[PDB]
């Protein structure tokens, strides 16, 4: 009820308050920010999910837009703190609402090296392999045969 008891319960970090923290971040996005900001995408909006470690997990498909390699880059997080600001961050600066670069209509969300290497290896057809020149009736059959 009172503020003092609430602060005491929060600083004590009981196991019950975790659901409150989970609900309060369910639809409350935050703003990720890279230290050097040169274009629009230097600050973006993201829905946070609670994890361990004092490190901030980031989606791999957006770091290329952030120009933030994983060699030890430090980034900041801000909170809208206002219903209007929350709605704005969800509307305009949302990650899904920013895929075309502000400079060119080309997608800034272009895949990085790992995924394209995996796909290139997956689709690079050889001349002789297990199941050479057989016939199938569906992609699910192919998944079963592969796994």
């Amino acid at each position: 009820t009172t503020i003092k008891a609430a602060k005491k319960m929060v600083e004590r970090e009981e196991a019950v308050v975790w659901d409150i923290l989970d609900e309060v971040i369910r639809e409350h996005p935050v703003l990720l920010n890279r230290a050097p900001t040169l274009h629009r995408l230097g600050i973006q909006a993201f829905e946070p999910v609670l994890i361990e470690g004092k490190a901030i997990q980031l989606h791999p498909l957006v770091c290329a837009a952030y120009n933030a390699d994983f060699d030890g880059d430090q980034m900041a997080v801000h909170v809208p703190l206002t219903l209007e600001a929350q709605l704005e961050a969800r509307a305009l600066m949302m990650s899904t609402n920013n895929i075309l670069s502000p400079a060119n209509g080309e997608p800034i969300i272009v895949p990085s090296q790992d995924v394209v290497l995996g796909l290139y290896y997956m689709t690079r057809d050889c001349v002789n392999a297990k199941g050479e020149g057989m016939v199938l009736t569906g992609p699910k059959e192919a998944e079963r045969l592969y796994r």
């Binding site: 470690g53 004092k54 490190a55 030890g72 430090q74």
Partner: protein, 50 residues
């Protein structure tokens, strides 16, 4: 010299040992290389950055 040193031990000369996945429990094709590399821990700990 490295080739002959690997030949001295039971390790393969190619320096690429096959690996088995821990989760799926199957074999990785394209036998990857494995070794023992010296690594250093930098003085940029997360406990001093957060």
């Amino acid at each position: 010299e490295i080739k002959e040193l690997l030949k001295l031990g039971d390790l393969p000369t190619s320096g690429q040992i096959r690996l088995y996945d821990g989760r799926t429990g199957e074999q990785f094709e394209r036998p990857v290389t494995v070794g023992y590399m010296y690594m250093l821990k930098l003085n940029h700990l997360v406990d001093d950055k957060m």
